[PDB]
Design an enzyme around this catalytic site. Structure first.
Site, PDB file in Angstrom:
ATOM      1  N   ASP B 167      -1.236  43.808  70.494  1.00  0.00           N
ATOM      2  CA  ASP B 167      -1.523  43.422  71.845  1.00  0.00           C
ATOM      3  C   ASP B 167      -1.590  44.673  72.711  1.00  0.00           C
ATOM      4  O   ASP B 167      -0.711  44.908  73.539  1.00  0.00           O
ATOM      5  CB  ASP B 167      -0.418  42.489  72.297  1.00  0.00           C
ATOM      6  CG  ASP B 167      -0.520  42.127  73.752  1.00  0.00           C
ATOM      7  OD1 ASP B 167      -1.660  41.864  74.214  1.00  0.00           O
ATOM      8  OD2 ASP B 167       0.546  42.085  74.421  1.00  0.00           O
ATOM      9  N   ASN B 414       8.113  47.010  64.927  1.00  0.00           N
ATOM     10  CA  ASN B 414       8.106  46.056  66.027  1.00  0.00           C
ATOM     11  C   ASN B 414       7.452  44.766  65.540  1.00  0.00           C
ATOM     12  O   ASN B 414       6.299  44.784  65.095  1.00  0.00           O
ATOM     13  CB  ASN B 414       7.383  46.629  67.243  1.00  0.00           C
ATOM     14  CG  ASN B 414       7.503  45.724  68.481  1.00  0.00           C
ATOM     15  OD1 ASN B 414       8.521  45.738  69.200  1.00  0.00           O
ATOM     16  ND2 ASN B 414       6.452  44.927  68.737  1.00  0.00           N
ATOM     17  N   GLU B 415       8.228  43.673  65.557  1.00  0.00           N
ATOM     18  CA  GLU B 415       7.756  42.316  65.292  1.00  0.00           C
ATOM     19  C   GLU B 415       7.008  42.169  63.955  1.00  0.00           C
ATOM     20  O   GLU B 415       5.886  41.666  63.915  1.00  0.00           O
ATOM     21  CB  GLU B 415       6.902  41.807  66.455  1.00  0.00           C
ATOM     22  CG  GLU B 415       7.674  41.690  67.844  1.00  0.00           C
ATOM     23  CD  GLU B 415       6.834  41.147  69.075  1.00  0.00           C
ATOM     24  OE1 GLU B 415       7.449  40.508  69.998  1.00  0.00           O
ATOM     25  OE2 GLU B 415       5.582  41.370  69.133  1.00  0.00           O
ATOM     26  N   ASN B 469      13.410  41.059  70.515  1.00  0.00           N
ATOM     27  CA  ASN B 469      12.369  40.660  71.458  1.00  0.00           C
ATOM     28  C   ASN B 469      12.404  39.143  71.645  1.00  0.00           C
ATOM     29  O   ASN B 469      12.197  38.390  70.681  1.00  0.00           O
ATOM     30  CB  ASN B 469      10.987  41.084  70.951  1.00  0.00           C
ATOM     31  CG  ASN B 469      10.871  42.568  70.764  1.00  0.00           C
ATOM     32  OD1 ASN B 469      11.773  43.289  71.151  1.00  0.00           O
ATOM     33  ND2 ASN B 469       9.754  43.041  70.190  1.00  0.00           N
ATOM     34  N   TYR B 471      11.292  35.805  74.406  1.00  0.00           N
ATOM     35  CA  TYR B 471      10.646  35.339  75.614  1.00  0.00           C
ATOM     36  C   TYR B 471      11.047  33.914  75.982  1.00  0.00           C
ATOM     37  O   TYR B 471      10.192  33.036  76.123  1.00  0.00           O
ATOM     38  CB  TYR B 471       9.158  35.469  75.426  1.00  0.00           C
ATOM     39  CG  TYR B 471       8.721  36.903  75.415  1.00  0.00           C
ATOM     40  CD1 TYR B 471       8.495  37.585  76.610  1.00  0.00           C
ATOM     41  CD2 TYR B 471       8.545  37.587  74.227  1.00  0.00           C
ATOM     42  CE1 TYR B 471       8.080  38.916  76.617  1.00  0.00           C
ATOM     43  CE2 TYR B 471       8.147  38.923  74.223  1.00  0.00           C
ATOM     44  CZ  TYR B 471       7.915  39.575  75.421  1.00  0.00           C
ATOM     45  OH  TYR B 471       7.521  40.890  75.438  1.00  0.00           O
ATOM     46  N   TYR B 475       7.002  32.148  76.629  1.00  0.00           N
ATOM     47  CA  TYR B 475       6.284  31.505  75.541  1.00  0.00           C
ATOM     48  C   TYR B 475       7.079  30.355  74.951  1.00  0.00           C
ATOM     49  O   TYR B 475       6.538  29.627  74.119  1.00  0.00           O
ATOM     50  CB  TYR B 475       5.946  32.471  74.406  1.00  0.00           C
ATOM     51  CG  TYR B 475       5.131  33.655  74.786  1.00  0.00           C
ATOM     52  CD1 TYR B 475       3.802  33.510  75.131  1.00  0.00           C
ATOM     53  CD2 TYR B 475       5.673  34.933  74.793  1.00  0.00           C
ATOM     54  CE1 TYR B 475       3.038  34.586  75.486  1.00  0.00           C
ATOM     55  CE2 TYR B 475       4.903  36.019  75.152  1.00  0.00           C
ATOM     56  CZ  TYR B 475       3.588  35.832  75.497  1.00  0.00           C
ATOM     57  OH  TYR B 475       2.810  36.894  75.854  1.00  0.00           O
ATOM     58  N   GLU B 509      12.683  43.372  74.504  1.00  0.00           N
ATOM     59  CA  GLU B 509      11.510  42.744  75.117  1.00  0.00           C
ATOM     60  C   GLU B 509      11.886  41.396  75.722  1.00  0.00           C
ATOM     61  O   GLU B 509      12.344  40.500  75.016  1.00  0.00           O
ATOM     62  CB  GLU B 509      10.379  42.567  74.095  1.00  0.00           C
ATOM     63  CG  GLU B 509       9.397  43.740  73.976  1.00  0.00           C
ATOM     64  CD  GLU B 509       8.213  43.495  73.020  1.00  0.00           C
ATOM     65  OE1 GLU B 509       7.812  44.457  72.326  1.00  0.00           O
ATOM     66  OE2 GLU B 509       7.660  42.367  72.960  1.00  0.00           O
ATOM     67  N   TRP B 554      10.426  44.338  79.237  1.00  0.00           N
ATOM     68  CA  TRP B 554       9.012  44.523  78.910  1.00  0.00           C
ATOM     69  C   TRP B 554       8.193  44.013  80.090  1.00  0.00           C
ATOM     70  O   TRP B 554       8.332  42.844  80.449  1.00  0.00           O
ATOM     71  CB  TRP B 554       8.664  43.746  77.639  1.00  0.00           C
ATOM     72  CG  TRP B 554       7.305  43.955  77.166  1.00  0.00           C
ATOM     73  CD1 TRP B 554       6.268  43.118  77.313  1.00  0.00           C
ATOM     74  CD2 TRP B 554       6.806  45.094  76.464  1.00  0.00           C
ATOM     75  NE1 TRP B 554       5.135  43.657  76.755  1.00  0.00           N
ATOM     76  CE2 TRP B 554       5.449  44.880  76.234  1.00  0.00           C
ATOM     77  CE3 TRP B 554       7.377  46.274  76.009  1.00  0.00           C
ATOM     78  CZ2 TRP B 554       4.662  45.795  75.570  1.00  0.00           C
ATOM     79  CZ3 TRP B 554       6.597  47.170  75.361  1.00  0.00           C
ATOM     80  CH2 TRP B 554       5.254  46.937  75.150  1.00  0.00           C
ATOM     81  N   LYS B 573       2.850  41.757  82.434  1.00  0.00           N
ATOM     82  CA  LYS B 573       4.288  41.647  82.391  1.00  0.00           C
ATOM     83  C   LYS B 573       4.961  42.864  82.976  1.00  0.00           C
ATOM     84  O   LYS B 573       6.186  42.935  82.979  1.00  0.00           O
ATOM     85  CB  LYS B 573       4.748  41.421  80.960  1.00  0.00           C
ATOM     86  CG  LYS B 573       4.317  40.095  80.410  1.00  0.00           C
ATOM     87  CD  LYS B 573       5.151  39.659  79.217  1.00  0.00           C
ATOM     88  CE  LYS B 573       4.509  38.509  78.486  1.00  0.00           C
ATOM     89  NZ  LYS B 573       3.182  38.962  77.968  1.00  0.00           N
TER      90      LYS B 573
END
Ligand SMILES: [Cl-]
Ligand SMILES: [Cl-]
Lengths: 594, 594
Positions: B167, B414-415, B469, B471, B475, B509, B554, B573
């Site tokens: 992203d 990351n992720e 991370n 949200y 989300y 994040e 983030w 964001k």
């Protein structure tokens, strides 16, 4: 057939009417204890709430904006004493979504469907000459047995949250004007007109329904009040020589006058002599082809939500005329009756839509209308209750709107499942019922999502013309893939062409979300420049098929939706902002449509 | 171990350096015919292209902004004649993503990895005293054998379009400064320092690598240039009495001075005496706990893309200080070396991240990081090539950045997928390799997506502290469901607590997309008020767990992404706008972090 009249209220000798619009009392009922606690008699601890309007956007806190469940209105009006011996009705333009009406303590009637009028016969409880009380219990929840469709989530505190299967905020309340009216004991209940053209001359065929047996006389007056035809009977033909026809964007309105005699009742309405026929791939209006140019719309404005105001109509029509449109679609629900009245004066063509949106089980329904995933929607055991509602909403819609000259087609669904015989069986019934309720048998249609592919769809044979919603270059191969998207579009239109159906196609949805004031060179999805480039490419495809006879762009104006990660304060696919100002693309339409 | 030196260039008697920054010649190579057609000798029909910068956002047409594939740079520089007998290198701060370097017609070296320096030994072709030519063939495609990961779509014309599994816009080019440098024939290649604290006193353990056998002397100077320690040998211990320690947001820099003698080479660098240790659930810096407060960031500014400019650093650090932050994460790739240099002066703590982003096959990767769908990513036969790249990027990163006092942890992913032993086997190798390349064995970590659930994840036992991370309220159960989201958050943190791992957790994040100037009362997702409410709720959850020792929000600033329907001109964001101005929530951080 219906236990009430759908006719707009008028005021003459025999028919009286009084407005209930103003500030009403309002109170939420989250524990659902109103009925058992005497709220039908008056509300225990109410607030003030404008009528007409939608309640949600007045409040400053989430729980109230997002309220889902039961809630009540109450007001008080004085009836003139002179209305003894008259039949007395309450007429709500709408009660969104369902409600039971109480008057002077008594339950009069309940209704299901939040976008069509509600009639309550209060003759036996109304006290002429005194002050009267009305109290309405309303519910704004969504389910799969009523329209429009959705679901209701219970959160951890037990409070309800609406989870619609559609892409528009679940506004609710008393959103349209509310009258109390007095009718004669023998009255005109309904009437219907159909038109034949005989060269320069014209026939207005009519039928009339009354609550009685007395003879009926029917008169037809021209714009200046002079008489041009008269016939006795509840069934007749009016001969208008050298007729003045209602034309696209050039209206002429005659006035029909219905009488019951010994004089017991008089009803008057403006009508327009015009004909609508589909010959082959053409839409003929008065025997000559017309190409539909305009917008899908919403009843949607800041603060008021879906509340009717005449000022919104005036501005919205001065903008349609500025783009040189001739047509709009009442998406996705019948509008307030004033919109059609004004379309009649201005010569706009209307596709009138019943609220059959949400017939695929998906809460992010607009990315999902092209995903390819069938939701088993018409196989479920609630479907027969749903069908009964849909047919009743089609029947009430058509009865209400059938005598407007601007209304030239009925849309009976937006973006449902069509790829299985479960849905054929369903829609076949709906069309069958709509064909019987329309005295003019004007074209019947619906709008198809991308998932209703030419190879799989079972329902397009029911349609007189076909409406397609397509987002090629937005939800499909958007952005840098926009040339792939044009191809794919042509690929599909090629397959439709190959079917040689010999019927018209109208694009009823295409658009891009566009943030006003986002400019980028080169353009990116979401900017104003991308909207122009998108439209110029869809136009090229439309112009490549002889049978595309209409473009209704989505949307006329930015509007409010359920909040979510894909929705930046509602839906920004408008060509106008929500305050009714034009983005760069509006000019594209203006130029193309001259 | 590496065939070149990663040390920053300096200028003294023995080491010389000349900047190549300016306007270069540039040309796209879409048919990929450069090599066979003599482009190594000069470009046939070039344009001007600034260096450093990213090429994409200069152009005004899509095909060039979105170019994917081969493309070339060329420039010309005069070498001083005095650089005979010196070894001469080209040093590119970066070549994004891969490239082959040609000089004076000859292929010098090729490199893979677009965020770490590239060294080209041109000693045997450089013509001192004359004009020299450099020519670089670059490729910016994405795959699954190199970092960061993705894919390449061929469109109908055969042109390539980048389809990243991450992203952020695929900026590329020569994005950082480019030098040509002269070294002595016997030179310092590398060195490493580790710190021990002995009460008020301190030991600087060091090792040195040279390209030769001559003796090494190591000196350590204080801020004012005065001497405080000296040791002979390539391995040694410097004794600093009454040492001045590098502290959080209060730096002190000593100067290390490495010499080779008979004097053949001199290297000088600023270092900071400090220690980093994880005891239990605490991060100790100089034996006292520290709580990380700051932001994930990006190398991202208007026009320049990922191009380095010192002015961006200055402003970004004056904003971090204004929010009272102490820490940032170089997400998702090592930055330009100047960022760490300046973090050293200002006392900021850095988590240094290798570009291992994209290790789950998804082009809309941010909705998909919590979908629950495993993409079989570490079962594929490209994985061994990928592992070799990842380890080589970890090795080059650590070698480059290890002697900065600000760098206190390494993030090695990351992720990614972590829920199967295929990924354990992979990451176990990576950590094993990183442990060997860091002379200080400082903490190693990575950031986990929501899909790496406590019950299923195999990889968190490799971590010295755990980065999450999350949200919750964006989300997941966003908007009107935000109280459901808090619960769910607590539910998960409860499960982590129950595992009694006795290690620190850092949230790396959390955030909401926020359009500057979108106000709504009550607040809606996307408005400025929702961002504040979101943050105030995540803060409550963080503050409920003894082992949460860090919050890195983030993002620091809005940044550019691949365009798409969920991205309104990039990623919003940020707590600052992309022009580095604060939204309403920045003040929330400021107050909390005082
Ligand atoms: Cl609130
Ligand atoms: Cl272009």
């Amino acid at each position: 057939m219906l236990e009430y009249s759908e006719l707009y209220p008028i005021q003459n000798g025999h028919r009286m009417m009084q407005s209930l619009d103003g500030m009403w009392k309002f109170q939420f009922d989250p524990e659902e204890i109103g009925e058992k606690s005497g709220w039908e008699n008056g509300l225990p601890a109410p607030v003030s709430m404008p009528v007409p309007s939608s309640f949600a956007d007045f409040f400053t806190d989430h729980k109230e904006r997002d309220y889902c469940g039961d809630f009540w209105y109450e007001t008080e009006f004085y009836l003139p004493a002179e209305w003894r011996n008259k039949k007395i009705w309450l007429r709500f333009g709408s009660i969104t979504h369902r409600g039971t009406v109480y008057c002077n303590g008594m339950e009069i009637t309940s209704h299901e469907g939040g976008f069509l009028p509600v009639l309550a016969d209060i003759s036996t409880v109304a006290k002429p000459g005194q002050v009267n009380q009305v109290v309405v219990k309303i519910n704004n929840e969504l389910n799969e047995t009523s329209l429009p469709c959705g679901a209701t989530k219970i959160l951890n505190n037990g409070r309800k949250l609406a989870k619609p299967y559609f892409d528009f905020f679940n506004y609710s309340g008393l959103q349209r004007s509310v009258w109390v009216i007095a009718l004669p004991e023998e009255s005109v209940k309904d009437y219907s007109v159909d038109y034949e053209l005989c060269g320069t001359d014209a026939l207005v065929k009519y039928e009339v329904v009354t609550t009685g047996e007395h003879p009926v006389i029917v008169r037809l007056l021209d714009a200046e009040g002079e008489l041009v035809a008269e016939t006795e009977g509840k069934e007749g033909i009016l001969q208008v020589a050298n007729a003045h026809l209602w034309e696209v964007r050039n209206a002429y309105l005659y006035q029909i006058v219905i009488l019951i005699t010994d004089v017991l009742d008089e009803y008057r309405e403006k009508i327009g002599i015009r004909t609508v026929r589909i010959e082959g791939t053409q839409i003929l209006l008065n025997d000559r082809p017309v190409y539909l140019k305009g917008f899908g719309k919403h009843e949607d404005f800041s603060i008021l939500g879906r509340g009717f105001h005449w000022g919104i109509v005036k501005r919205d029509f001065e903008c349609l005329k500025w783009t040189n449109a001739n047509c709009f679609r009442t998406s996705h629900y019948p509008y307030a009756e004033e919109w059609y009245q004004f379309a009649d004066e201005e010569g706009f063509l209307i596709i009138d839509e019943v609220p059959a949106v949400g017939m695929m089980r998906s809460t992010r329904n607009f990315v999902a209308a092209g995903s390819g995933n069938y939701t088993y929607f018409f196989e479920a055991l609630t479907v027969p209750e749903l069908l009964k509602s849909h047919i009743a909403d089609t029947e009430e819609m058509i009865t209400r709107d059938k005598n407007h000259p601007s209304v030239i087609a009925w849309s009976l669904f937006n973006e449902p499942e069509t790829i299985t015989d479960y849905a054929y069986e369903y829609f076949k019934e709906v069309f069958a019922a709509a064909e019987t309720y329309d005295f003019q048998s004007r074209p019947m249609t619906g709008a198809f999502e991308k998932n209703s592919k030419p190879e799989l769809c079972k329902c397009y044979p029911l349609c007189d013309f076909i409406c397609l919603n397509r987002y090629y270059g937005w939800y499909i191969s958007g952005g840098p893939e926009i040339e792939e998207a044009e191809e794919l579009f042509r690929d599909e239109m090629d397959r439709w062409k190959a079917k040689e159906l010999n019927v018209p196609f109208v694009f009823t949805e295409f658009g891009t979300d566009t943030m006003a004031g986002l400019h980028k060179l080169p353009s990116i999805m979401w900017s104003e420049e991308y909207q122009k480039e998108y439209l110029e490419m869809n136009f090229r495809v439309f112009d490549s098929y002889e049978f595309v006879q209409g473009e209704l762009a989505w949307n006329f104006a930015d509007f409010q939706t359920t909040e979510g990660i894909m929705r930046v304060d509602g839906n920004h696919k408008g060509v106008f902002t929500r305050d009714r100002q034009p983005k760069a693309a509006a000019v594209v339409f203006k130029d193309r449509w001259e």
